[PDB]
Structures are given as C-alpha cells and as structure tokens.
Amino acid sequence: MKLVRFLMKLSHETVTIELKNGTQVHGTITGVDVSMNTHLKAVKMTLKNREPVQLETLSIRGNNIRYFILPDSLPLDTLL
Amino acid sequence: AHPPELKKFMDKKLSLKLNGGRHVQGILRGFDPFMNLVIDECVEMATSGQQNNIGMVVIRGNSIIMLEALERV
Amino acid sequence: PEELQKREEEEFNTGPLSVLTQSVKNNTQVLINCRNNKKLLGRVKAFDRHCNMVLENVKEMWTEVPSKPVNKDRYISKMFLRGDSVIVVLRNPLI
Amino acid sequence: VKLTAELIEQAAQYTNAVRDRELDLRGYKIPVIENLGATLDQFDAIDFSDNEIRKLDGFPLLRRLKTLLVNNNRICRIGEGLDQALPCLTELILTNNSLVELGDLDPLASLKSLTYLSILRNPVTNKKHYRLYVIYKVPQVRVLDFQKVKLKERQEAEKMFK
Amino acid sequence: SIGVPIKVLHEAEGHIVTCETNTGEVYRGKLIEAEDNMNCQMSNITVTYRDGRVAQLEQVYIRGSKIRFLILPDMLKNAPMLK
Amino acid sequence: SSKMLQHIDYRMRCILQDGRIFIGTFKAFDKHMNLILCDCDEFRKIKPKNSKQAEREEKRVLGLVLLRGENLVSMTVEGPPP
Amino acid sequence: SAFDLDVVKLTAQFVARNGRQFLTQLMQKEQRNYQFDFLRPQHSLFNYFTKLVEQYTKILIPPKGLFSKLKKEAENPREVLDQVCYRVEWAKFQERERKKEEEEKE
Amino acid sequence: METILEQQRRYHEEKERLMDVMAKEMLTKKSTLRDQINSDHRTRAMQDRYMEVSGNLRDLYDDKDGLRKEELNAISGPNEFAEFYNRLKQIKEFHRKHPNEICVPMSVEFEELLKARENPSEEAQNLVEFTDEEGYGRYLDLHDCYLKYINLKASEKLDYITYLSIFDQLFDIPKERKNAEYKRYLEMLLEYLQDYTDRVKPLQDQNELFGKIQAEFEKKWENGTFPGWEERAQRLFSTKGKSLESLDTSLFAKNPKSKGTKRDTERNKDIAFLEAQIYEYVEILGEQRHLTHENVQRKQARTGEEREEEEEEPYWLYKLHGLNINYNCEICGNYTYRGPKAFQRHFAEWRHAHGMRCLGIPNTAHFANVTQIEDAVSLWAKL
RNA sequence: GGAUUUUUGGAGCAUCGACCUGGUAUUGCAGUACCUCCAGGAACGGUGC
C-alpha cells in the first residue's frame, strides 16, 4: 500500500514538515492530497540560519518536502 | 510523451550548453522524445581556448539546458 | 486488485525491500541515510513501493561544524520520511 | 474625516509606472497620518496627494517602503522619528509644503539611504543658501529638486557655516 | 488535459517573453512556438550567463527541465483563461 | 480537494528553490504546481560576505510570471485581492 | 442627560460635607434664586440623588481611603474570593427566601 | 478635578461591579473543564484589574489630607458651588442622552449567550496557553521531556513508563549525577512544571506561593531539611554527609562549600532552587501526574482504533400573474403596488379606506378606481 | 501516480549594474533587455570558480 493514503487522512494535527533546502515549517496541517501537497494554517517557518517567521497559511509541495514529524498522540495502526 | 519541435534545427549547425558549464557545437542529425540530441562534427569547448573534436556525440535531455542555432534555421 | 496486491506482497517479501520487510517482521531498527547527511536509526512501521517510511522512536544524528564538528543528535517519537531523500538503508546497524 | 485602516484597505493598490507597488490615496484630506501598519510591508510607494496633514509624523515601522509622496499638502513641521521607521527610504517628495525655516530639514538628514529629494514650491527654498544648507545637512542625497549635486556646490557647503 | 499556466504560456507566443534558466541565465526574446512541456523557442534572445553579459543569439530553444520561470508581457494579463 | 483553488487570485508569496521569493497575484494554477503570478516581484537575498556588512534583499518586478513546479518550494498568503 | 447628572453629582458632593441635616450647602442655595428641582423628594431623580449622597458619604469613610489603606481587598485574592462566595451564598439565601415567600403566597 | 470625591467613588463602584461579576461567576454552575478554566482565567483577570484599581485609588490620598481642611469647612460652601454651576452653564444644544454611566461597566463585566467571555477578556483563548495533549489542566505533556532525557542519557533503554517512574521520586537517589548535564534538562522541566502549575490554577495567588516556596527553601532546605538517625545531615549542594549539627554549621561557611567547588552554593544555587521547585510541583500536582500516567497507560494498552477514537475527541409566476410591475397610488401617500390585481384587491381594503377617510370621502363603489386626490375630491363634490 | 521536460532529489580571476568631473552633435511624437563618443578618479555592490 502507498504511504500517501496514510498522510491524506490527517486533519487539524500539529505536525512539522522539514523541507529540502534547510526549511522547517511547524503548524496545523489542514489539507493533504495525493501529490503530498501540505496546506497548513498558522504555521511557523524557520529557514537555514534564519529567524523563525510566522505565516497565517502555507502550501508546501510534495517534491520540496524532505521529512515529516508527527506528535506522539497519533496511532499508526488505524492510519494504515 | 510528445516529441519536441526540433524539425527546424535538423541538419543545421547549432551550439548547445550542457549542465555544469559544459558547451558543445555541431550539426543536429536527429531528435528524440526524451530531448536526446545527436550531434555530428561535435566540437566541445572547455574553459580554456582549445576545443576537442568528438565526431559523433549523443546528449541526453536531462543535461541540455539551452541550444542556440548558429544558422538561419 | 487481489493479484496486484499479491504481486506487491511478493515483491516486498522477496525483492530489494525485503530487508524493510525485516523491519516489520521482528520490529528491528534500521538506519536510513538522508540527503542532508543525517542518519536516522529506528524501527519502521509502514513502507511503500516508493520507499516512503514511517518511523517510530527514531534517533537522527548528523555532523554540524561550529575546529572539530560535534555529533549533535535528536530523538523523534513518530516521523515520516519520503523515499526521494533515502540514499542507503542498512538493515542491521552496528550500534 | 480621519485616516484609519478602512481607508487604507479600500484604497487602490496596484503597480505604478516605476515598477513598484503603490497605493493611491488622493482626495482624502487626512489631517493626521496614522494606522498605516495594515499594509504588512507589501508596498514600496505611498501617495498622500491632496491632504490636510499639518505634520508628517506617526509613521509605523515599514522596511519595504522606498518612496514617499507628500505633495500638495500643508505640512508646516517635520517629524524626527522618520529614519527609525523607514530604513530603506530612497525617494522623498515634499513639494508644495509650508516650510519656512531652515531648521525643519534637520531631521531630514537622519535618513542615510535617502538619495532623492524634492523641496520645490516651498518658502524654505526662497531664502538664501538653501541648497547649500541642504547639501551640507544631508550629503547622501544625490538628487535635490530634480537636480544633481555639484562638486563646487559641495565645496561651498563645506566652506560655509564653518 | 492542458493546464491553465500551460495555456497562458501557449497563448503568450508571438510576444516578447523572458525565460529563466536553472543556472541563473535569463533569456528575453520573441516566443515563436511553445509546447505543453514548457519548451520555449524564442528568437532574438538575449543570454545573460548569470553575469550580466547579455549576448544576442538567434533561434534559441530552452527545455522545460531547466526553465525556472517565464516572465510574460503585460498584454496577456486580460486573458479569459486566467479570469 | 480544492485547497489550492481557495487562495486563487490573491497576493501570495511563493518561495523558490534557490532562496528567492516571488510575491504576486497567483491567478492560474495547475496539477504540476505551476503558478501564473500577475504583477510579480522576485526578491533574492544577497550574502554580506563581511563582518560588519548587513544582509540585504534585491527586489525586481517582472509582471506576469509563469513559475513551474520544479522550482517552487512553498507558497504563503501575504495580501488580499485588490 | 449629562448636565443633570453632573448637577446631581455636584449637589451630592456639596451636601455630603455638611455638619448638620438642614445646615448644608444646598438649603441656602435654594433661597439664593437657584432653581434646583432635584432637592424635592417628589421627583424620580431624588431617589438617585439620595444614593449618590450615600455613596459620597461612604467615600468619606476612614476605611474608604482618607486616612487608611485597605490591605485585604487590595493585596489578598483569597479574601476577595471568600467575599464573593459569601455574596453568592447571601444571594442563594435571598432566592430561597423569595421562593419560600412565593410558596406561602401560593 | 474631584480626585478624592468623584474618582474614589468611581473606583469603589468599579470594585463593587467587579465583586458582583465575580459572585455571579462563582454562583453559576459549570459543565465543562475548558469553560471552567476560561471562567477562572476571566475571574483572575478581573481580580487583577480590581487590584490595580485599588492600588491606583490607594495612592490618591496625598492632596486629600490638605484638601480636607477646606472641604470640611463650614465658612465656605455655596460660593465655589455657584462658581462651578456658572462654569457648568454652557450650551445645552447637544440633545443626546447617555445612559452608559453605570450600565457600561455592568455590560463590560458580562458575557453573551453565543460566547461566554467578558469584554476585556474577549481576546482570551484557552488554546494559546495550553496544548491539546494537556486537556486544559487534565493531563501533562511529558513526551518532549522524555525525548530530551533519552537524548541526554544517549540510550534507548528508557521508555515512557521508566521515565514516569524516575520522575515520580522526590527524595530518593537520582538516576544520573548531580554535577552532570542532566541539571540543564531538569531546570527546563521545572520551568515547564511551574508554568503547568500556574496554568492549572489561575485564581490562586502565585506570588504568595512563590514567596512561601522561597522561604521554605531558604529557612528549611538550606539548614538540613532531611534529618537522620554521614546520614544524620545531608547537603543538597555539596552532596556530602555530616557528623553533627555543629560540624555542618562549621562546614557551611567553609571555602570549598562557598565557591571552591563546582557544585557549591555560589554557582549551583539556581540548580538546587530549580530542583526544590520541581519537587514542590511534583508534591503539589501529584494527582495530575498520576492521571497523566494513567492516561499514558490507557493509550499504550489500547489498540489502534481505540487510540484513534480517543485522539479524535420564480420568474414565471411573477411574469404570468402580472407581478413585479411598479404601480403608484397617490391616495395612500403615493404607495407602491406590485400588481394590478393586488392594487384592485387593496383598493377595497382597510388601508385604502383609512387613506380615503382623511380627505372626507366615504367608502363607496364610485371611488374604487380613484387614484388621485383631486379626482376623488371632484367625484365627492359632484355627488 | 516511482526511469531524462515538472511530483519520489544532482544532492585572487571574469562579467555586469552603478558614483563623480569637462568637451562634443541631436530639440526629435511613442509604447521599451541597453542606447552619442572620448579622457580622469573611485577608499560601491551582485553572480560563478
């Protein structure tokens, strides 16, 4: 089974998506598609050796994301 | 999987620029759907003034960034 | 369908990702290398054909130069890693 | 009618002729400039034509601003905390003002990145040695009243008021 | 199907556009013909080579793999596809 | 869903892969993460390369810009549609 | 209604500093050709003027802030919480007494 | 200005309104924990505002002692009152009533039916001070502290239950060394536990509790708070025993104990204070820690579906009938009618009869199609 | 939805844009990479190696 269906079933979860070019956006992921497009609201983005800015809404692509970080209160057996 | 419009550049002396600062020049003898070109009388120009003759070269589409036609085309 | 699922299970049990099938059989920790020179050691809960892994209780270590570089590491409870950044995956780590 | 965020949100913000983001606010007659921080630093030029602003003060911290248009107004005094609010200011249009004394341009030398200035149609320019005092006050300004600075004018500014 | 930025790039043929290469080179010229895979064929192109040295080349063709951006002219801003 | 179409024709800033940020009115999008930014302005940060020099950002306006998905990293909303 | 309220507040401030019931700063002002209709008890504003005079008299108390400083109400949140609980208990007792009076009337 | 008369009475009325709002908040029953925490935060904000108002009113007594000699004088009086009445004799052309003298503090200290929040506390939110895993004081988040402890210990042999068992100790032996790098994580854990204790009870006096904790740390913990029967007296900073109380009193002012060590009373005093604060927070909030451990055990013992369930908690009718057609009736004050049949039905009605009775024309059948007032007057005069 | 053009990863030198001084011809109606040339100083900045 593909891992995109497990990531698509996530709403109102405070995750942290670390991008490829030293960027990390921590926020509440509100939308996920089949192309791993993460649309989040009220996120904080920190670039490579820069100050963490705050954005009201963000839309990160699938090919630009490098890793994800989920909270500890999230079961993986029901999402797969 | 549509092929590029390389019919005007066929059998014409052009010069392409590969990735990493590489550049070559020659006559395009064909085209591919994956943007792969075949160059006859290929002369690769390095950062120095000398140019190395290759005879027949096959360049892929993942490395070719631009190609300027030196003829009227 | 069912035949495609059986072929995918056979390719996951006998193919190159069979060591990843060792990660879901006995719950053994694997070490995956990233593109940013960050090695993550941990158990793999879910995998796919595109090498997308779901890691639980993983430890990510890397080298950061401040001189001599230090081995600054972090520990994540649950994480997800895409298969595009996976370089080398070792089934049995040394330590 | 006082200036608020509703007049700035309903204004027309578009691209100007200098390839910069400008918001038009002509025909407002605002007596005081305040609550201008609602733009979120998304503009480079602010026009304030046909206004009744008696003093150019009360400007929030905007780093993206690079041009100020305060033409056709009644500004008699100038504020002092203008350099700390607009660090990237380059153009200043203070034409048709009520400046009479030469001391009003003394905070105007506080902007280090200022290069363009316009003090035409003002009573301060009618006095003697006004351009020399403006060159001796702010040496970073390269264009003053649609005219470039001169080396002989800079020498006369450095020689005078010694 | 065809995308709306792809249709905007196909409708921008015949005007002066400016493509951007992956190495920082910006080539501005008249787009003769475009493709669905962002293949930009431009005449009277002005190459920059990421140093400002703008040389005038004729019949340039940049592929879609290295095309980072495509500055279109302002005449196509009132297109019905963008609405 | 239609989460990408909800922020259409608004003043959004998309971060490029090279570090630049293009702010403009993204009117058209596609499935390949393309963007059509009307009256776009690209800002690129420059390195100080010194001990006392500050970090600046050069901004240039281009107009209508067709940005492909291979260079776009993340897009954030900055301003409402005028 | 701001001018009448200000005049009532001024009358309550001038009447609270009197040393007698009838020897005040408003009884002599009525004979000085000054029209003051709020002094008579037949008007509805007299009930508010009496409460304003009572508040002015309670603002002149020795624990009201003239010669002493309140410490339990200003530097003890637990005392304020106990006073709020006592006020809630008094309101509940008043509601129970009103319910008992309504049951007796029924 | 009447700072002693009007301002003191206004401050007393504001304090009485705040006390009435606090009594109305305490008298109302609660149904949820988040709404009760929001009501407690609003009551704490109202108590802080009342304390600030009382502190502002208590400082307005310097000129009152000088003005009481002139205010209580019976020789003065109606002269200054007549001067103030002549000063208050301005133009009364502002015909506007202002009933918000006392009703506006009553409405500002109240809530609405759609949102149970006060007017100063309209921007307050429970999601900006507590996390989703805490549950507004129901549990405590310990996953980040366990991750920091696993990163500091550099070993994967410590689970959440082992970290909860190591954190449950108060006066036992520590898991690591006291002079190691675990004190930097323990200070952050104490700073998180202090904020969790301050968020779990906003109505309690935090300054008085901090002063009592500082007094217990200075007067008792610094003078041998744990007696014995090296075991008689133990020091928290030096981590060494003592033979008697006189030897400990002589070694308390010693040169290695003052600043001649790495864990003396000069540098390691803040770490000892943070450890004492963490011990006080564990002793005061042990029930919340036990509830968090029970919730963690219930989340670990459940399956995936149980954990997922726990974590989720018409123009045709207007065109055919002749409607939408503007018709003017000059008899009934030039009213509008959206239909000929509707106007014919409203002509023999009560509104047209009341409009025609003002002109003096009787309600008959001859004035049925009469629209103008002059034509109706001519028809009434012709008959 | 994994095989080259978008989405399961190639990760001290050269050039250009300016700043300041003098001579020089064009006085002209249009939707723009950049527009006259020479000489002198610079202790301005970006990009690639």
From Swiss-Prot, chain A:
Keywords: Cytoplasm, Isopeptide bond, Methylation, mRNA processing, mRNA splicing, Nucleus, Repeat, Ribonucleoprotein, Spliceosome, Ubl conjugation
A cellular component annotation (GO) from this entry: U5 snRNP
Location in or out of the cell: Cytoplasm, Cytosol; Nucleus
Domain of life: Eukaryota
Region described as Sufficient for interaction with CLNS1A: 1-80
Record's keyword annotation contains Cytoplasm: yes
Protein name according to UniProt: Small nuclear ribonucleoprotein Sm D1
Organism: Homo sapiens
Location of this fragment in the whole protein: 1 to 80 of 119
From Swiss-Prot, chain C:
UniProt superkingdom: Eukaryota
Subunit structure: Core component of the spliceosomal U1, U2, U4 and U5 small nuclear ribonucleoproteins (snRNPs), the building blocks of the spliceosome. Most spliceosomal snRNPs contain a common set of Sm proteins, SNRPB, SNRPD1, SNRPD2, SNRPD3, SNRPE, SNRPF and SNRPG that assemble in a heptameric protein ring on the Sm site of the small nuclear RNA to form the core snRNP. Component of the U1 snRNP. The U1 snRNP is composed of the U1 snRNA and the 7 core Sm proteins SNRPB, SNRPD1, SNRPD2, SNRPD3, SNRPE, SNRPF and SNRPG, and at least three U1 snRNP-specific proteins SNRNP70/U1-70K, SNRPA/U1-A and SNRPC/U1-C.
Gene giving rise to this polypeptide: SNRPD2
Positions of the Sm domain: 17-95
GO cellular component: catalytic step 2 spliceosome; cytosol; extracellular exosome; methylosome; nucleoplasm; nucleus; pICln-Sm protein complex; precatalytic spliceosome
GO biological-process terms attached to the record: 7-methylguanosine cap hypermethylation; mRNA splicing, via spliceosome; RNA splicing; spliceosomal complex assembly; spliceosomal snRNP assembly; U2-type prespliceosome assembly
InterPro entries membership: LSM_dom_sf (IPR010920), Sm (IPR047575), Sm_D2 (IPR027248), Sm_dom_euk/arc (IPR001163)
Name this protein carries in UniProt: Small nuclear ribonucleoprotein Sm D2
SUPFAM superfamilies assigned to the protein according to its UniProt record, in alphabetical order: Sm-like ribonucleoproteins (SSF50182)
Annotated source species: Homo sapiens
Subcellular location: Cytoplasm, Cytosol; Nucleus
Lineage, uppermost ranks: Eukaryota, Metazoa, Chordata, Craniata, Vertebrata
Start and end residues of each stretch annotated as Disordered: 1-19
Classification via Pfam families: LSM (PF01423)
SMART domains on file: Sm
Primary location recorded for the protein, binned into one broad class: cytoplasm
Gene3D superfamilies xref list: 2.30.30.100
Curated annotation (Swiss-Prot), chain D:
Repeat is among the record's keywords: yes
Gene Ontology annotations for the cellular component aspect, listed alphabetically: catalytic step 2 spliceosome; nuclear body; nuclear speck; nucleoplasm; nucleus; small nuclear ribonucleoprotein complex; spliceosomal complex; U2 snRNP
Keyword RNA-binding annotated: yes
Protein name, per record: U2 small nuclear ribonucleoprotein A'
Family: Belongs to the U2 small nuclear ribonucleoprotein A family.
Mutation effect (E91V): Results in defective spliceosome assembly
LRR repeat copies, ranges: 19-40, 42-63, 64-85, 88-109
Effect of R26Q: No change in spliceosome assembly
Known partners and oligomeric status: Identified in the spliceosome B complex. Identified in the spliceosome C complex. Found in a pre-mRNA splicing complex with SFRS4, SFRS5, SNRNP70, SNRPA1, SRRM1 and SRRM2. Found in a pre-mRNA exonic splicing enhancer (ESE) complex with SNRNP70, SNRPA1, SRRM1 and TRA2B. Contributes to the binding of stem loop IV of U2 snRNA with SNRPB2.
Result after altering N71K: No change in spliceosome assembly
Entry keyword set: Acetylation, Isopeptide bond, Leucine-rich repeat, mRNA processing, mRNA splicing, Nucleus, Phosphoprotein, Repeat, Ribonucleoprotein, RNA-binding, Spliceosome, Ubl conjugation
GO biological process per UniProt: mRNA splicing, via spliceosome; RNA splicing; spermatogenesis; U2-type prespliceosome assembly
Originating organism: Homo sapiens
From Swiss-Prot, chain G:
Site feature: Critical for binding to SF3A3: L10
Tissue expression pattern: Ubiquitously expressed.
Listed result of changing L10K: Abolishes binding to SF3A3
Localisation: Nucleus; Nucleus speckle
Ranges occupied by SURP motif repeats: 7-49
Domain of life: Eukaryota
Assembly description: Component of the 17S U2 SnRNP complex, a ribonucleoprotein complex that contains small nuclear RNA (snRNA) U2 and a number of specific proteins. Part of the SF3A subcomplex of the 17S U2 SnRNP complex which is composed of three subunits; SF3A3/SAP61, SF3A2/SAP62 and SF3A1/SAP114. SF3A associates with the splicing factor SF3B and a 12S RNA unit to form the mature 17S U2 small nuclear ribonucleoprotein complex (17S U2 snRNP). SF3A1 functions as a scaffold that interacts directly with both SF3A2 and SF3A3. Identified in the spliceosome 'E' complex, a precursor of the spliceosome 'A' complex.
Function: Component of the 17S U2 SnRNP complex of the spliceosome, a large ribonucleoprotein complex that removes introns from transcribed pre-mRNAs. The 17S U2 SnRNP complex (1) directly participates in early spliceosome assembly and (2) mediates recognition of the intron branch site during pre-mRNA splicing by promoting the selection of the pre-mRNA branch-site adenosine, the nucleophile for the first step of splicing.
Written domain comment of the UniProt record: SURP motif 2 mediates direct binding to SF3A3.
Protein name (database record): Splicing factor 3A subunit 1
Organism in which the protein naturally occurs: Homo sapiens (Human)
Full protein stretch here: 160 to 265 of 793
